[PDB]
């Protein structure tokens, strides 16, 4: 199984220059001496289209990808259309382009909104997904133009060094809703999240669906008792397993609406990416949130809040697998290394059961699947867990590159895992 390692968030500075270039030589030389198949790089939106809606600066990225080609390592480009940075700690911040942020400020409903009005600036909402709101362009048009610029610049690399394009379709590059606002500690693990669909641009489609279904009362707003982010599934009457609203007709209708809007956002961006990258020796992948916690509950409230209509009665990953099979897209899944006992048991976290369900859905839809770890860990216990999960994976992406991985014991464990997976 191919092994891929991810470049840190400081792979490119605020300016389009490579950060710690000699350090990246050290890291990459160690990596290809270790036999690692390849590497995963975040092509950021705010570091390429930072100030001009048409000018695409590719300096540091061109250096980095040509450099990775020189060291013979495959590149998995992740089309990062999301903001990152200061949420609880500092880390490093790569904001959205300034013109995009100005558009979001003048029209606040361009960002995902929760029940209580909090707006998440990590990503541009899907309520305005096809509206010409970004300097006369729709968000699909902006993402498509970014992908076209990337393809035009790196055409000599596609099919030779770049072998995978993960599409950023939501926060953290995951096709989901921003139901985990760790910013300001709004959400803390464990939790269920909220419904990030309160833009009026999407409440309009809610009203449309409610009128189509002949229910001119189910489109006014979302659930009134869904629960706050850090609440528990049994604390909310919507997500309770004892005949809760998630089983009612209104719950089924709203959850189908939510999941199908997320699926339609996926459909649009995936079709655009397939059109842009058609017949070029490269594959297209979509990252799906690895929501392991609260798996034991019947409702699966975190999955329901993050756009996945996955319950004990409905398999919510089967439609996503159908979409990826339709567009010939790779299913990328997190939370592979973790174990059930390692995670807290009071929250009924079942990472292995979730991974098994994902594998079943991918087998049903004949969708190739790739895995990645959720947290950076060097233990042979997690390495053997990943080995078993791959044995049952088209590729594995490892988080995260750092000098800690180049220590003696950590490096030995990492290379041992590498030639065990190989």
């Amino acid at each position: 199984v191919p092994v891929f390692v991810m470049m840190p968030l400081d792979s490119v500075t605020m300016g389009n220059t490579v950060n710690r270039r000699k350090a990246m030589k050290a890291s990459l030389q160690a990596l290809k001496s270790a036999g690692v198949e390849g590497i995963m790089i975040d092509v950021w939106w705010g570091l390429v289209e930072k100030e001009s809606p048409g000018t695409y600066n590719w300096g540091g990225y061109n250096e980095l990808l040509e450099l990775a080609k020189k060291l013979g390592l495959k590149v998995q480009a992740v089309m990062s259309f999301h903001q990152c940075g200061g949420n609880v700690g500092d880390s490093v911040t790569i904001p959205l382009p300034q013109w995009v942020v100005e558009e979001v400020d003048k029209d606040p409903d361009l960002a995902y909104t929760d029940q209580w009005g909090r707006r998440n600036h990590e990503y541009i909402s899907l309520g305005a997904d096809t509206l010409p709101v970004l300097k006369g362009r729709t968000p699909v048009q902006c993402y498509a133009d970014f992908m076209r610029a990337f393809r035009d610049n790196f055409k000599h690399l596609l099919g030779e060094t770049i072998v995978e394009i993960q599409v950023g379709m939501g926060p953290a590059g995951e096709l989901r809703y921003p139901s985990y606002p760790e910013q300001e500690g709004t959400w803390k693990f464990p939790g269920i999240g909220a419904f990030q669909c309160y833009d009026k641009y999407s409440l309009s489609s809610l009203k449309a669906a409610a009128e189509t279904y002949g229910k001119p009362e189910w489109g006014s707003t979302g659930p009134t008792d869904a629960g706050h982010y850090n609440n528990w599934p049994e604390d909310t009457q919507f997500f309770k397993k004892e005949g809760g609203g998630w089983n009612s007709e209104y719950g089924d209708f709203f959850l189908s609406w939510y999941s199908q809007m997320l699926l339609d956002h996926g459909e649009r961006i995936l079709s655009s990416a397939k059109s842009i990258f058609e017949n070029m020796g490269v594959k297209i992948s979509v990252k799906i949130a690895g929501i392991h916690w609260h798996y034991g509950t019947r409702s699966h409230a975190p999955e329901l809040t993050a756009g996945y209509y996955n319950t004990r009665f409905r398999d919510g990953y089967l439609p996503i697998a159908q979409m990826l099979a339709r567009h010939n897209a790779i299913f990328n899944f997190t939370c592979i290394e973790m174990r059930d006992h390692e995670q807290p048991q009071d929250a009924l976290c079942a990472p292995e059961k979730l991974v098994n369900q994902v594998a079943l859905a991918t087998l049903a839809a004949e969708v190739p699947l790739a895995g990645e770890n959720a947290l950076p860990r060097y233990d042979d216990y997690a390495h053997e867990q990943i080995l078993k999960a791959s044995a049952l994976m088209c590729a594995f992406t490892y988080l995260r590159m750092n000098p800690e991985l180049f220590q003696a014991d950590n490096w030995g464990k990492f290379v041992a895992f590498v030639k065990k997976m190989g």
């Binding site: 509206l131 006369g136 655009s272």
Partner: protein, 191 residues
């Protein structure tokens, strides 16, 4: 299932120019600058109009032809709820920019049509009571007849381009955005 659809509530004046084409579908032709539909950035050009409401909101009645929209456009004060359907592929407003209003016409040579069959008259001249009409009309514009009437006579050609008494004297455009960049993006997408 119908996720291309969306409901929007607008206070009068609506500020929308509608285009009845030779398919029965009532498009949106142009938007008046500074209008309520201009403020509501979700209403694009080319989005089909499926249903509509009345002054008090009433019931969200489906619109079949010009007859249903006539009552909506006759009024001048109130709040109307409109259901629009986004086209499966983005509307080529390139044709609206290029072709003149005479080019996109159905009855260019206004061939006369005299009829007594209510099944051929649009849903403002039917009276839909017992049988095939009582009174006959002689009309030259194909906007007074149903698609069956148009088929008997024989972007899709438009049989009419109608509006209401929108005040403010705002220019009819295609939305408040860099329209040149929007078209450039459209040709980049289709190419």
């Amino acid at each position: 299932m119908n996720l291309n659809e969306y409901m929007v509530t607008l206070e009068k004046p609506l500020g929308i120019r509608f285009a009845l084409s030779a398919d029965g579908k009532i498009f949106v032709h142009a938007i008046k600058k500074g209008s309520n539909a201009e403020k509501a950035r979700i209403i694009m050009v080319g989005d089909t109009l499926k249903k509509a409401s009345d002054s008090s909101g009433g019931t969200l009645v489906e619109i079949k032809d010009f007859g249903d929209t006539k009552k909506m456009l006759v009024e001048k004060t109130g709040s109307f709820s409109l259901v629009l359907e986004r086209p499966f592929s983005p509307f080529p407003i390139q044709y609206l920019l290029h072709l003149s209003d005479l080019d996109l016409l159905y009855n260019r040579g206004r061939v006369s049509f005299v009829t007594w069959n209510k099944n051929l008259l649009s849903s403002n001249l039917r009276a839909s009571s017992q049988g095939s009409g009582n009174s006959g009309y002689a009309a030259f514009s194909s906007k007074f007849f149903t698609p069956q009437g148009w088929k008997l006579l024989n972007i899709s050609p438009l049989v009419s381009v109608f509006s209401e008494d929108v005040p403010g004297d705002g220019e009819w455009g295609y939305g408040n955005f860099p329209l040149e960049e929007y078209i450039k993006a459209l040709d980049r997408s289709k190419g």
